[PDB]
Structures are given as C-alpha cells and as structure tokens.
PDB file of C-alpha atoms and ligand atoms in Angstrom:
ATOM      1  CA  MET X 536      15.147  22.663 171.451  1.00 50.28           C
ATOM      2  CA  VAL X 537      14.799  18.893 171.535  1.00 52.86           C
ATOM      3  CA  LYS X 538      13.606  17.572 168.159  1.00 50.45           C
ATOM      4  CA  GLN X 539      11.132  14.865 169.158  1.00 51.06           C
ATOM      5  CA  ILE X 540      10.402  12.419 166.346  1.00 49.43           C
ATOM      6  CA  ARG X 541       6.620  11.945 166.029  1.00 50.21           C
ATOM      7  CA  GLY X 542       5.985   9.693 163.064  1.00 50.43           C
ATOM      8  CA  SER X 543       7.160  11.511 159.936  1.00 51.19           C
ATOM      9  CA  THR X 544       7.264  14.887 161.691  1.00 51.22           C
ATOM     10  CA  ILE X 545       9.234  16.750 164.356  1.00 52.93           C
ATOM     11  CA  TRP X 546       7.758  18.222 167.507  1.00 53.90           C
ATOM     12  CA  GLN X 547       9.898  20.730 169.423  1.00 55.98           C
ATOM     13  CA  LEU X 548      10.208  19.870 173.115  1.00 55.42           C
ATOM     14  CA  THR X 549      11.319  22.491 175.596  1.00 59.24           C
ATOM     15  CA  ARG X 550      13.424  21.742 178.653  1.00 59.98           C
ATOM     16  CA  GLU X 551      10.373  22.349 180.862  1.00 58.67           C
ATOM     17  CA  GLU X 552       8.272  19.857 178.896  1.00 55.82           C
ATOM     18  CA  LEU X 553      11.075  17.305 178.966  1.00 56.54           C
ATOM     19  CA  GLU X 554      11.563  17.753 182.734  1.00 56.11           C
ATOM     20  CA  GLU X 555       7.903  17.192 183.516  1.00 54.52           C
ATOM     21  CA  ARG X 556       7.848  14.034 181.379  1.00 55.62           C
ATOM     22  CA  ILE X 557      10.910  12.446 183.009  1.00 56.63           C
ATOM     23  CA  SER X 558      10.112  13.690 186.541  1.00 56.14           C
ATOM     24  CA  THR X 559       8.240  10.580 187.763  1.00 53.81           C
ATOM     25  CA  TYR X 560      10.895   8.060 186.690  1.00 53.60           C
ATOM     26  CA  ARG X 561      13.622   6.505 188.798  1.00 53.92           C
ATOM     27  CA  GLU X 562      16.256   6.556 186.049  1.00 53.72           C
ATOM     28  CA  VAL X 563      16.766   8.021 182.581  1.00 55.95           C
ATOM     29  CA  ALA X 564      18.633   6.132 179.866  1.00 58.13           C
ATOM     30  CA  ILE X 565      19.813   7.547 176.540  1.00 56.11           C
ATOM     31  CA  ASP X 566      20.688   5.287 173.583  1.00 53.34           C
ATOM     32  CA  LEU X 567      22.853   7.315 171.195  1.00 52.09           C
ATOM     33  CA  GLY X 568      22.940   6.160 167.578  1.00 58.11           C
ATOM     34  CA  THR X 569      19.837   4.042 168.272  1.00 56.38           C
ATOM     35  CA  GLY X 570      19.308   3.272 164.573  1.00 57.22           C
ATOM     36  CA  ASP X 571      15.906   1.561 164.387  1.00 59.76           C
ATOM     37  CA  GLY X 572      15.234   2.132 168.067  1.00 57.92           C
ATOM     38  CA  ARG X 573      14.811  -1.537 168.948  1.00 59.88           C
ATOM     39  CA  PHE X 574      16.993  -1.079 172.051  1.00 62.96           C
ATOM     40  CA  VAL X 575      14.597   1.600 173.287  1.00 64.00           C
ATOM     41  CA  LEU X 576      11.480  -0.480 172.644  1.00 65.66           C
ATOM     42  CA  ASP X 577      13.051  -3.434 174.479  1.00 65.95           C
ATOM     43  CA  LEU X 578      14.433  -1.496 177.482  1.00 64.17           C
ATOM     44  CA  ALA X 579      11.327   0.607 178.060  1.00 65.23           C
ATOM     45  CA  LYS X 580       9.165  -2.518 177.989  1.00 64.00           C
ATOM     46  CA  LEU X 581      11.485  -4.282 180.450  1.00 65.90           C
ATOM     47  CA  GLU X 582      11.995  -1.348 182.851  1.00 66.41           C
ATOM     48  CA  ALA X 583       8.790   0.539 183.603  1.00 66.80           C
ATOM     49  CA  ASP X 584      10.588   2.910 186.026  1.00 67.32           C
ATOM     50  CA  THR X 585      13.224   3.951 183.458  1.00 69.30           C
ATOM     51  CA  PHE X 586      12.568   6.707 180.933  1.00 66.06           C
ATOM     52  CA  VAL X 587      14.380   5.705 177.707  1.00 63.96           C
ATOM     53  CA  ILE X 588      15.384   8.240 175.034  1.00 68.19           C
ATOM     54  CA  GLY X 589      16.685   6.996 171.666  1.00 70.40           C
ATOM     55  CA  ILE X 590      18.683   9.522 169.616  1.00 71.34           C
ATOM     56  CA  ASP X 591      19.742   9.236 165.976  1.00 71.23           C
ATOM     57  CA  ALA X 592      20.850  11.730 163.350  1.00 72.59           C
ATOM     58  CA  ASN X 593      18.640   9.881 160.845  1.00 75.14           C
ATOM     59  CA  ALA X 594      14.988  10.086 161.850  1.00 75.01           C
ATOM     60  CA  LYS X 595      13.572   8.016 158.990  1.00 76.39           C
ATOM     61  CA  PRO X 596      14.028   4.551 160.621  1.00 77.25           C
ATOM     62  CA  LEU X 597      12.512   5.948 163.809  1.00 77.10           C
ATOM     63  CA  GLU X 598       9.253   7.182 162.199  1.00 75.79           C
ATOM     64  CA  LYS X 599       7.408   3.922 162.759  1.00 79.14           C
ATOM     65  CA  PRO X 600       8.894   3.118 166.198  1.00 80.98           C
ATOM     66  CA  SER X 601       7.840   6.590 167.317  1.00 80.24           C
ATOM     67  CA  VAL X 602       4.253   5.819 166.303  1.00 78.54           C
ATOM     68  CA  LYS X 603       4.347   2.403 167.933  1.00 80.37           C
ATOM     69  CA  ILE X 604       5.265   3.863 171.335  1.00 82.31           C
ATOM     70  CA  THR X 605       2.338   6.338 171.240  1.00 78.10           C
ATOM     71  CA  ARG X 606      -0.415   3.722 171.292  1.00 76.06           C
ATOM     72  CA  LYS X 607      -2.325   3.002 174.476  1.00 75.12           C
ATOM     73  CA  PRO X 608      -0.518   0.494 176.727  1.00 72.68           C
ATOM     74  CA  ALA X 609      -2.680  -2.489 175.827  1.00 72.68           C
ATOM     75  CA  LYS X 610      -1.724  -1.957 172.154  1.00 72.55           C
ATOM     76  CA  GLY X 611       1.997  -1.905 172.908  1.00 72.70           C
ATOM     77  CA  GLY X 612       2.548   1.745 173.670  1.00 71.57           C
ATOM     78  CA  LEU X 613       5.379   2.786 175.958  1.00 71.43           C
ATOM     79  CA  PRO X 614       4.826   6.055 177.816  1.00 66.69           C
ATOM     80  CA  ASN X 615       8.409   5.831 179.116  1.00 67.18           C
ATOM     81  CA  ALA X 616      10.014   6.015 175.655  1.00 66.32           C
ATOM     82  CA  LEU X 617      10.957   8.956 173.438  1.00 64.28           C
ATOM     83  CA  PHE X 618      12.784   9.307 170.090  1.00 65.53           C
ATOM     84  CA  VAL X 619      14.883  12.374 169.276  1.00 66.55           C
ATOM     85  CA  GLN X 620      16.655  13.529 166.119  1.00 67.23           C
ATOM     86  CA  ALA X 621      20.179  14.805 166.834  1.00 67.06           C
ATOM     87  CA  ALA X 622      23.769  14.260 165.800  1.00 69.02           C
ATOM     88  CA  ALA X 623      26.378  13.374 168.422  1.00 65.37           C
ATOM     89  CA  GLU X 624      28.410  16.439 167.424  1.00 65.81           C
ATOM     90  CA  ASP X 625      25.495  18.782 168.156  1.00 70.25           C
ATOM     91  CA  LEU X 626      23.396  17.420 170.987  1.00 68.65           C
ATOM     92  CA  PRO X 627      20.671  19.741 172.342  1.00 65.40           C
ATOM     93  CA  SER X 628      21.446  21.662 175.524  1.00 65.53           C
ATOM     94  CA  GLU X 629      18.077  20.615 176.941  1.00 66.85           C
ATOM     95  CA  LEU X 630      19.422  17.108 177.489  1.00 64.46           C
ATOM     96  CA  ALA X 631      22.281  18.291 179.719  1.00 64.67           C
ATOM     97  CA  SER X 632      22.665  16.195 182.867  1.00 62.54           C
ATOM     98  CA  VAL X 633      19.482  14.179 182.210  1.00 61.03           C
ATOM     99  CA  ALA X 634      20.839  10.622 181.911  1.00 61.62           C
ATOM    100  CA  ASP X 635      21.791   8.041 184.495  1.00 61.31           C
ATOM    101  CA  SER X 636      23.011   5.781 181.675  1.00 59.22           C
ATOM    102  CA  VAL X 637      24.131   6.412 178.111  1.00 58.67           C
ATOM    103  CA  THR X 638      24.756   3.623 175.635  1.00 60.39           C
ATOM    104  CA  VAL X 639      26.443   3.692 172.234  1.00 62.02           C
ATOM    105  CA  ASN X 640      25.805   0.192 170.847  1.00 63.33           C
ATOM    106  CA  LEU X 641      27.457  -1.027 167.629  1.00 63.46           C
ATOM    107  CA  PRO X 642      28.125   2.483 166.282  1.00 64.22           C
ATOM    108  CA  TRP X 643      29.083   2.949 162.657  1.00 64.54           C
ATOM    109  CA  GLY X 644      30.607   5.687 160.540  1.00 65.69           C
ATOM    110  CA  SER X 645      31.328   8.983 162.231  1.00 64.57           C
ATOM    111  CA  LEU X 646      29.970   7.868 165.633  1.00 67.74           C
ATOM    112  CA  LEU X 647      32.241   4.796 165.598  1.00 67.25           C
ATOM    113  CA  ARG X 648      35.191   7.076 164.783  1.00 63.08           C
ATOM    114  CA  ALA X 649      34.115   9.460 167.545  1.00 59.71           C
ATOM    115  CA  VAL X 650      34.082   6.872 170.350  1.00 60.95           C
ATOM    116  CA  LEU X 651      37.171   4.858 169.344  1.00 58.16           C
ATOM    117  CA  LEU X 652      39.604   7.449 167.991  1.00 53.42           C
ATOM    118  CA  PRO X 653      38.220   9.239 169.974  1.00 53.51           C
ATOM    119  CA  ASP X 654      36.863  12.648 168.989  1.00 53.74           C
ATOM    120  CA  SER X 655      37.111  14.721 172.158  1.00 52.93           C
ATOM    121  CA  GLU X 656      34.441  17.190 171.040  1.00 54.32           C
ATOM    122  CA  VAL X 657      31.906  14.357 170.790  1.00 57.60           C
ATOM    123  CA  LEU X 658      33.152  12.891 174.094  1.00 54.54           C
ATOM    124  CA  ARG X 659      32.581  16.232 175.839  1.00 54.19           C
ATOM    125  CA  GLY X 660      29.064  16.352 174.393  1.00 51.82           C
ATOM    126  CA  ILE X 661      28.286  12.812 175.550  1.00 51.47           C
ATOM    127  CA  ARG X 662      29.660  13.656 179.010  1.00 49.65           C
ATOM    128  CA  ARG X 663      27.304  16.647 179.215  1.00 51.64           C
ATOM    129  CA  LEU X 664      24.287  14.308 178.869  1.00 49.66           C
ATOM    130  CA  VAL X 665      25.245  12.314 181.951  1.00 50.51           C
ATOM    131  CA  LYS X 666      24.373  13.128 185.539  1.00 50.48           C
ATOM    132  CA  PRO X 667      27.388  13.192 187.873  1.00 47.86           C
ATOM    133  CA  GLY X 668      28.134   9.592 188.755  1.00 46.24           C
ATOM    134  CA  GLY X 669      26.124   8.194 185.845  1.00 47.26           C
ATOM    135  CA  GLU X 670      27.575   5.729 183.365  1.00 47.22           C
ATOM    136  CA  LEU X 671      28.444   5.494 179.665  1.00 47.92           C
ATOM    137  CA  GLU X 672      28.834   2.163 177.904  1.00 48.45           C
ATOM    138  CA  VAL X 673      30.243   1.868 174.382  1.00 45.22           C
ATOM    139  CA  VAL X 674      29.880  -1.523 172.648  1.00 45.40           C
ATOM    140  CA  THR X 675      31.632  -2.331 169.378  1.00 47.35           C
ATOM    141  CA  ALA X 676      32.283  -5.501 167.370  1.00 45.72           C
ATOM    142  CA  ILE X 677      34.637  -4.121 164.711  1.00 48.70           C
ATOM    143  CA  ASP X 678      37.463  -6.600 164.155  1.00 48.02           C
ATOM    144  CA  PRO X 679      41.010  -5.356 163.498  1.00 50.49           C
ATOM    145  CA  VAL X 680      41.794  -8.187 161.052  1.00 50.70           C
ATOM    146  CA  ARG X 681      38.456  -8.589 159.282  1.00 50.33           C
ATOM    147  CA  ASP X 682      37.485  -4.901 159.179  1.00 50.79           C
ATOM    148  CA  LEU X 683      40.852  -3.380 158.213  1.00 53.70           C
ATOM    149  CA  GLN X 684      39.495  -1.333 155.299  1.00 53.63           C
ATOM    150  CA  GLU X 685      36.506  -0.012 157.235  1.00 52.67           C
ATOM    151  CA  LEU X 686      38.867   1.029 160.029  1.00 52.35           C
ATOM    152  CA  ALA X 687      41.119   2.825 157.534  1.00 51.12           C
ATOM    153  CA  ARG X 688      38.176   4.660 155.965  1.00 53.25           C
ATOM    154  CA  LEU X 689      37.136   5.940 159.418  1.00 51.63           C
ATOM    155  CA  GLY X 690      40.547   7.281 160.351  1.00 52.07           C
ATOM    156  CA  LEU X 691      40.992   4.409 162.782  1.00 50.80           C
ATOM    157  CA  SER X 692      44.089   2.958 161.141  1.00 51.56           C
ATOM    158  CA  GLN X 693      46.140   3.511 164.308  1.00 53.08           C
ATOM    159  CA  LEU X 694      43.985   1.433 166.681  1.00 55.63           C
ATOM    160  CA  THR X 695      46.081  -1.001 168.747  1.00 54.91           C
ATOM    161  CA  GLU X 696      45.430  -2.785 172.020  1.00 56.56           C
ATOM    162  CA  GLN X 697      47.773  -0.303 173.723  1.00 58.08           C
ATOM    163  CA  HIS X 698      45.530   2.516 172.452  1.00 59.42           C
ATOM    164  CA  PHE X 699      42.599   1.110 174.402  1.00 55.44           C
ATOM    165  CA  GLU X 700      44.659   1.048 177.620  1.00 53.86           C
ATOM    166  CA  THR X 701      46.445   4.392 177.272  1.00 53.18           C
ATOM    167  CA  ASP X 702      45.524   7.129 174.774  1.00 53.96           C
ATOM    168  CA  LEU X 703      41.825   6.274 174.681  1.00 55.86           C
ATOM    169  CA  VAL X 704      41.534   6.049 178.483  1.00 57.96           C
ATOM    170  CA  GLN X 705      43.295   9.407 178.840  1.00 61.63           C
ATOM    171  CA  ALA X 706      41.093  11.101 176.233  1.00 59.23           C
ATOM    172  CA  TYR X 707      37.946   9.918 177.974  1.00 58.01           C
ATOM    173  CA  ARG X 708      39.362  10.974 181.379  1.00 54.75           C
ATOM    174  CA  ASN X 709      40.110  14.451 180.045  1.00 57.76           C
ATOM    175  CA  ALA X 710      36.469  14.665 178.927  1.00 57.46           C
ATOM    176  CA  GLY X 711      35.186  13.739 182.393  1.00 56.42           C
ATOM    177  CA  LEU X 712      34.632  10.020 181.706  1.00 51.73           C
ATOM    178  CA  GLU X 713      36.624   7.707 183.995  1.00 48.63           C
ATOM    179  CA  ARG X 714      37.067   4.124 182.801  1.00 49.55           C
ATOM    180  CA  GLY X 715      35.750   1.200 184.821  1.00 47.34           C
ATOM    181  CA  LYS X 716      37.832  -1.963 184.270  1.00 46.79           C
ATOM    182  CA  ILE X 717      24.599 -12.145 174.602  1.00 45.69           C
ATOM    183  CA  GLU X 718      20.903 -11.580 175.305  1.00 45.34           C
ATOM    184  CA  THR X 719      20.779  -7.857 174.615  1.00 44.77           C
ATOM    185  CA  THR X 720      19.168  -6.047 171.719  1.00 47.36           C
ATOM    186  CA  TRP X 721      22.523  -5.439 170.078  1.00 48.59           C
ATOM    187  CA  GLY X 722      23.762  -8.969 170.749  1.00 48.02           C
ATOM    188  CA  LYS X 723      20.961 -10.259 168.564  1.00 47.98           C
ATOM    189  CA  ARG X 724      22.365  -8.284 165.603  1.00 48.90           C
ATOM    190  CA  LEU X 725      25.721 -10.083 165.609  1.00 49.46           C
ATOM    191  CA  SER X 726      26.935 -12.945 163.478  1.00 51.65           C
ATOM    192  CA  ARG X 727      28.799 -15.697 165.329  1.00 50.29           C
ATOM    193  CA  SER X 728      32.118 -14.395 163.985  1.00 50.34           C
ATOM    194  CA  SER X 729      31.341 -10.857 165.149  1.00 52.79           C
ATOM    195  CA  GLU X 730      30.531 -12.096 168.658  1.00 54.91           C
ATOM    196  CA  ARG X 731      34.202 -12.903 169.276  1.00 49.99           C
ATOM    197  CA  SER X 732      35.170  -9.280 168.479  1.00 50.50           C
ATOM    198  CA  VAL X 733      32.895  -7.577 171.009  1.00 52.92           C
ATOM    199  CA  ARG X 734      34.556  -4.874 173.116  1.00 53.11           C
ATOM    200  CA  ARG X 735      32.590  -3.193 175.915  1.00 53.27           C
ATOM    201  CA  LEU X 736      33.961   0.075 177.332  1.00 52.99           C
ATOM    202  CA  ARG X 737      32.386   1.494 180.483  1.00 52.50           C
ATOM    203  CA  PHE X 738      32.974   4.901 182.092  1.00 49.70           C
ATOM    204  CA  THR X 739      31.661   6.936 185.037  1.00 52.17           C
ATOM    205  CA  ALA X 740      30.865  10.607 184.638  1.00 51.63           C
ATOM    206  CA  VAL X 741      33.160  12.554 186.970  1.00 53.27           C
TER     207      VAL X 741
HETATM  208 CL1   CL S1308      20.568  -2.290 169.572  1.00 54.13          CL
HETATM  209 NA1   NA S1309      23.328   2.920 170.396  1.00 54.44          NA
END
C-alpha cells in the first residue's frame, strides 16, 4: 500500500482511497526525493488544480510538512498535497500511471546515481508512475570538476558529455522515457557557483 506520512506516523492508503482523492484534480505531480517537501508546499499553493505528491525514503524531515498541509485552508493547509514514504527502487504499485509530471530535483546519493548512471531498474519504476504522454524532469547541479570525489563515490566516475547524449539517452529510451531536447524551489537552494552547473533533463513517457 501507499505509506502516507501523517506527522510522526504512517497511514496506509489503498489505491481506491488514492483514486478518490486525486479524482477531482486536473493534473497530478510527483516530486521524487522531495527531501523537506518544500517543492510540494510551493507547487500545491501555486496550482490549486494540481494534486502534488512528495515522496522520500526518509520520512523524518516530512513529519512537520505533513502536519502543516493538514490544517484548514485559512491556516495554510493544502488539501491538494500528500507526502509518502518510499524508496525509488521500491515504489508502491498503487502509484502506477498516476502522474502527469514527475520531478527529481537536486538528487543525492543513490537517487543521483540512479538518474545519471543510470540505474535501469529505478528508471523503469519511475516510468511506471507516469501516465502515457506525461513528463519526467531531472535537475542536477553536480559539477564534474568541483564534485569529482562525490561522483567517484557514487559510481559516476565515467560521466562525460558524450554520456549525456548517447548512453544515458538510450538507457532512458529503453525504459520508456524519450528525451526532449532560477525562481523555483530548488533554484533557491543553490550557491552562485552551483547555478552554473545546472543540468535539466526532460523526457516523455512513451
Ligand atoms: Cl526543491
Ligand atoms: Na525531487
């Protein structure tokens, strides 16, 4: 089932319950590796007709955001937001085909490895979240010259510009994700130096 984060507890959500809750919304967005969930709080506030789901393997930083969104609207609550505990390697089947848009913003650790190497098992799982014709956007600011040791630690020692035009594109394509050619929540987390290293990768679910 879907592990909904409700403060410092989990509530199990069935597919039926999830479908009824998203059923009145024009679009569904999933933020994978949401971290503290700020992207979800910002997007749900900005887009009342979008249902926004933030997913992270670590629920602890989402305990308080998940309380904040439950308040009545005049106290800042967001009935179009939801936080879920899950790892990208083991996403719940109840989320299959739910999302018009999936974002992976400034991933770290295993999720950064998964989207840049990439790890095809994680790519297939991300693809399964997306409705046919929906979109995935991966945003990273890791710098090949400043972050050499972090890249090595993550198994990303072989990243080159040619990788992003060939092997990576083909791996995403084989997983059903076809490639498509800063005042955002994630842009506000970047130092000036990191801003020059931003790479945005966009794909359509096919
Ligand atoms: Cl963010
Ligand atoms: Na993200």
